[model samples]
Target: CTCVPPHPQTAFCNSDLVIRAKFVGTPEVNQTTLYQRYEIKMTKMYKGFQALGDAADIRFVYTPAMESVCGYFHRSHNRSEEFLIAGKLQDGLLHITTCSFVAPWNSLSLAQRRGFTKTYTVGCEECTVFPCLSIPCKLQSGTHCLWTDQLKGFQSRHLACLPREPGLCTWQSLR
Candidate 1:
């Protein structure tokens, strides 16, 4: 199967914190491992914050010397550049990866950016997909099924069940 990036909404649903923030100053480099840490100034929080006021000093780590080993060193660090960062809290520090959904704020459409403000109505649950012979099949709550021609082996057509909103679902062929 082909590996694909998660949808932005799905990434938002999975992250422990989603914030629109700007990177302040230069990154602090760890001499031994060449890991870099950045200080962020949070402008808005989409989730994982209890208060409405400004957040405390937030920082994240990345490796600037290693890009082949799942290290993300391709960020633009202009103080005026803002980003919508989806990350998780690890060891009391926010962490982000190349897999994380990091988008430039100005690059998104107004409606797409506004989606971050809307409360997520879905749970952070995983869904299992199975083959179905018909269009409408019995599925568990919070699961959706879609027809796909990407299946092989014994099945002629396959139905993929995933934990996603029907209105937000979009399909693309691998070929």
Candidate 2:
């Protein structure tokens, strides 16, 4: 996969309030915070399920809740490159924070990828916000999966928070 540069740290570039983060384990009960950052570069855009005449470019910065960190990392320590969630935005409305599904890269098939609309997607939404040095946080933290929506006002719950099974959200192509 190709890595893109960080967006201008300005408000317009980072103003989208919506955050779609996932945690696999039970971080709340364990009392831990796993720290990680998510960056998304928009390659396309849509309106009411219709592709816009012009594509949109956007980015996101996410910080998961401290309590959710433990469970996410603890629960999803095994799988690598999982699907996190999606987001949407309309004129002036802002849809922030929702869950999607978790498609572990190793487990997904070609049909699954095409159906889910994933392209070079990586990161385990099952991540924590705690510093890497903390014993509990470090032990719990691992290579997590993460993604952000090109639009705002969209929330992803099931995708960020891994489901016990697959096919929670309809798959689509990000290419």
Candidate 3:
């Protein structure tokens, strides 16, 4: 379950379902596999709406009920606090991991929200975030965005990788 954290856009592009929602009720623990389950109050769907077969109203999301697995640990929020979450769908139920793109909605920057709901998808098909941990974070490919924010500051988190044209991906402040 060891993993290097992925950028928001990378998680966005990788996930099958992305939503802004809040947790509800107690987890229905699977006695057999031990996977935990929880219902969600879905505020909005950023992607994979068709995966639900036209609104079944069966709001189910699951997680790993183990410490050894990479799972999104459910916090007992029992009240109003929406979060931006992106995860995979096993058949129909959404499954989240520690690596899923998840953050409290209120904690998101304007540009990050914009990228989640708007701009990131524009370049999701073409661009890749290349985070440089040191001084010379140079671009190896035109399709890659040189993210120096790791060595610099968090300015890049407020930015989005943009595909201005084919094979011309770059980072731009999406605000």
Q: What lDDT tens digits, residue by residue, belong to model 3 across residues 1-175?
A: 8654467877788888888988877778787987888788888888776576565543777888775787567664544888888888887778887767777888787777887888778878899988775578778889898765532147536777878788998778853
Give the range of the ten consecutive residues with the poorest summed lDDT in model 2.
Answer: 3-12
Write down the TM-score for model 3: 0.84
**Candidate 1 local lDDT, 1-175, one digit each (tens):** 1222344555666777888988876767676876667777887778776422354546554434344544455468478899888777766667776667677888754544644565232323443222344565665334433332332211111112233454332221111
What are the runs in model 2 whose C-alpha is more than 4 Å off? Answer: 1-37, 42-53, 61-64, 69-84, 88-98, 102-107, 117-175
Residue 65's lDDT within candidate 1 is 39
Model 3 residue 46 CA deviation in Å: 1.3
Report how far off residue 100 is in candidate 1 (Å): 0.7
The per-model lDDT (C-alpha) reads 0.54, 0.28, 0.76
Q: How do the residues 20-119 of candidate 2 rate in per-residue lDDT, one tens digit apiece?
A: 2333333222226343324333332211223232343334323344434321222355323333233334353322222322223345445333323332
Highest TM-score, which number? 3
